[PDB]
Amino acid sequence: ALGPLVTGLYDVQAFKFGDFVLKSGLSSPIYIDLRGIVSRPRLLSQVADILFQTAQNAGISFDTVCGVPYTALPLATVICSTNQIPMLIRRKETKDYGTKRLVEGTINPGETCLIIEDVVTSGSSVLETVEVLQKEGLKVTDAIVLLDREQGGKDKLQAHGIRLHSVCTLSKMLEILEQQKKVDAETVGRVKRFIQE
Amino acid sequence: LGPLVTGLYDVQAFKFGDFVLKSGLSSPIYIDLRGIVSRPRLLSQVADILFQTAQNAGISFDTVCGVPYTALPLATVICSTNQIPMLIRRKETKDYGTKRLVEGTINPGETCLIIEDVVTSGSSVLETVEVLQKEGLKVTDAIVLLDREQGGKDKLQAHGIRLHSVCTLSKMLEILEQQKKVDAETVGRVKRFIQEAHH
Ligand SMILES: O=C(O)c1cc(=O)[nH]c(=O)n1[C@@H]1O[C@H](COP(=O)(O)O)[C@@H](O)[C@H]1O
Numbered sequence: 071a072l073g074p075l076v077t078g079l080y081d082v083q084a085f086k087f088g089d090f091v092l093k094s095g096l097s098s099p100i101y102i103d104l105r106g107i108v109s110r111p112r113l114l115s116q117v118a119d120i121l122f123q124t125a126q127n128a129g130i131s132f133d134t135v136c137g138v139p140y141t142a143l144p145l146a147t148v149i150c151s152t153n154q155i156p157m158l159i160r161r162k163e164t165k166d167y168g169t170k171r172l173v174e175g176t177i178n179p180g181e182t183c184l185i186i187e188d189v190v191t192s193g194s195s196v197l198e199t200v201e202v203l204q205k206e207g208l209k210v211t212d213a214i215v216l217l218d219r220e221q222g223g224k225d226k227l228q229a230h231g232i233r234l235h236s237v238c239t240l241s242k243m244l245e246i247l248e249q250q251k252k253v254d255a256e257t258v259g260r261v262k263r264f265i266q267e
Numbered sequence: 268l269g270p271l272v273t274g275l276y277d278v279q280a281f282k283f284g285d286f287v288l289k290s291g292l293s294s295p296i297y298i299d300l301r302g303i304v305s306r307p308r309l310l311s312q313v314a315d316i317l318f319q320t321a322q323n324a325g326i327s328f329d330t331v332c333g334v335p336y337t338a339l340p341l342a343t344v345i346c347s348t349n350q351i352p353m354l355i356r357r358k359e360t361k362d363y364g365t366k367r368l369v370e371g372t373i374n375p376g377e378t379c380l381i382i383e384d385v386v387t388s389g390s391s392v393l394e395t396v397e398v399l400q401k402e403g404l405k406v407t408d409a410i411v412l413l414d415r416e417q418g419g420k421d422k423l424q425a426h427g428i429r430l431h432s433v434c435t436l437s438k439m440l441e442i443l444e445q446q447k448k449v450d451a452e453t454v455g456r457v458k459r460f461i462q463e464a465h466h
């Protein structure tokens with residue numbers, strides 16, 4: 071069902087082309103922004119559903135769910151509300167200022183927390199949230215992400231005991247967009263070539 | 268309403284002791300809904316009651332926005348359940364490299380409904396209203412689960428915003444007494460505190 075999902079994303083302007091610098095400091099000709107999904111109720115639901123379905127298809131076990139701040143937060147909420155799962159919230163809005171504790175919700179050490187994320191590049195953002203949760207005594211083995219950019223994330227997460235499960239890779243997303251005439255072939259070629267370097 | 272209060276009790280939402288509120292006054296009671304994320308059924312019920320309050324008021328709006336932070340998931344559930352477009356206010360500490368203040372599709376002149384967990388002075392609601400107004404949205408109404416009855420309705424009215432409350436602190440204390448979760452002493456103590464706090 072990726073074709074409709076990707077089009078849906080394109081139509082909330084999820085795909086930005088231009089010259090960007092990523093969290094990891096990499097230049098990129100493309101930037102994928104899922105903040106707009108909250109403007110299209112059905113699309114937000116579709117994204118929540120496919121994320122959850124990805125976790126279920128993998129056959130994994132978890133007691134609770136945490137979104138990586140900020141864009142993934144509503145996705146976690148919809149998943150948890152629809153499927154009746156307790157949720158944890160990592161509060162990042164005051165960063166490391168003062169001494170208030172960073173994680174909201176019921177933390178029962180030994181329980182497994184599933185991570186929900188929007189886009190993974192290097193993997194560092196997921197891992198930062200993973201470490202925070204592990205330091206509270208929670209077990210964390212799996213992360214589900216909507217878009218894997220395929221820039222080292224799976225391998226970096228696996229090096230820390232985390233299995234990355236993605237709905238779609240960047241290359242598959244670019245292929246759908248070209249097939250659907252949303253982006254031209256030269257842009258896809260340029261974007262792929264650039265990323266490779 | 269009773270069942271909703273019981274759920275809130277279970278997620279330890281009612282704290283007693285001595286607390287300084289954001290408005291700088293001391294209080295014998297604090298209502299902390301942060302634990303509601305651990306009970307998705309209760310979260311949904313809270314979300315539904317807030318939305319029904321708006322619907323029974325016959326107000327109209329184009330989008331919905333929660334006051335940071337506890338209410339963010341309540342707005343998300345209202346919007347998800349009822350298929351309403353959402354805005355998210357992103358409140359941080361004005362550090363270097365902050366991003367836009369409101370996420371989602373902003374159509375200037377459209378009307379945004381504000382959703383809140385607890386109102387005391389009304390200042391927290393008003394801050395969010397002003398951010399949305401600056402971004403070009405019309406705001407006329409706020410729905411709050413618990414109105415602590417410390418001048419919120421008036422403060423908000425003074426800035427053109429009508430506060431609708433699901434429940435007041437007075438009422439919630441009565442329900443809590445009925446359910447034998449709080450004694451006839453601390454009920455009086457908190458009651459006395461409410462008239463005191465209006466000064
Ligand atoms: O900055 C990125 O690398 C990034 C690329 C992109 O296409 N979309 C995007 O949202 N990002 C943001 O950067 C974070 C991922 O970068 P890593 O921490 O390197 O995986 C994600 O959580 C995104 O929020």
Ligand SMILES: O=C(O)c1cc(=O)[nH]c(=O)n1[C@@H]1O[C@H](COP(=O)(O)O)[C@@H](O)[C@H]1O
Nearest residue numbers: 288289290297298385386387388389390391
């Ligand atoms: O500090 C409060 O007033 C307050 C009291 C309370 O019982 N529960 C509670 O959550 N608050 C928080 O304080 C703010 C409400 O205070 P005002 O900004 O004065 O209306 C909101 O951010 C509330 O979430």
Ligand SMILES: [Cl-]
Nearest residue numbers: 144147340343
């Ligand atoms: Cl949320």
